[PDB]
């Protein structure tokens, strides 16, 4: 039982759980047809905005560590993510949607503090609730 240094500095480096607060965290695999998405091997000199390895290593037992509340997007645990630039700019910089560029990227599970589901359709399709919040300055009660 080495528990090889492949798990040791790649078991999170306890990072992104405490880095770019370790929640909102969500969907979408360790890899499928390698042509398209991208800033794959291009996030300026690192892959600080992607991940490297190991579904069995960390996710099975890593632990509860470092949070924000519950859950649930679409589904549950098999393969996940890493970034600081979540739901709004999570999708003007990566992972467009439905199906995608390449052939239709697939699946994962989330947990932030905004109460609800899917994480694909309404939250993650270049939704400019930044440029449609100068719409609220007179809405819902005013004369």
């Amino acid at each position: 039982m080495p528990n090889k240094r492949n798990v040791e500095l790649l078991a999170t480096l306890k990072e992104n759980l405490e880095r770019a607060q370790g929640s909102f965290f969500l969907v979408n695999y360790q890899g499928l047809p390698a042509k398209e998405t991208h800033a794959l091997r291009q996030a300026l000199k690192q892959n600080g905005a992607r991940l490297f390895v190991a579904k069995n290593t960390l996710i099975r037992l890593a632990l509860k560590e470092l949070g924000l509340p519950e859950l649930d997007g679409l589904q549950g645990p098999s393969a996940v993510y890493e970034d600081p630039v979540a739901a709004a700019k999570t999708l003007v910089q990566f992972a467009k949607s439905n199906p995608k560029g390449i052939p239709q990227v697939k699946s994962g599970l989330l947990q932030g503090q905004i109460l609800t589901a899917k994480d694909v359709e309404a939250l993650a399709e270049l939704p400019t609730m930044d440029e449609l919040r100068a719409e609220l300055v007179g809405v819902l009660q005013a004369p």
């Binding site: 739901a87 930044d130 919040r133 819902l140």
Partner: peptide, 30 residues
């Protein structure tokens, strides 16, 4: 000038900040 107080006082987070929070208060009030 004031595209910079109204594009940067709401990008204390590029993501859900007050950003996703008057989508949830346009939601709460009719």
């Amino acid at each position: 000038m004031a595209l910079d107080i109204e594009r940067i006082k709401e990008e204390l987070s590029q993501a859900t900040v007050l950003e996703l929070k008057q989508l949830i208060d346009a939601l709460k009030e009719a």
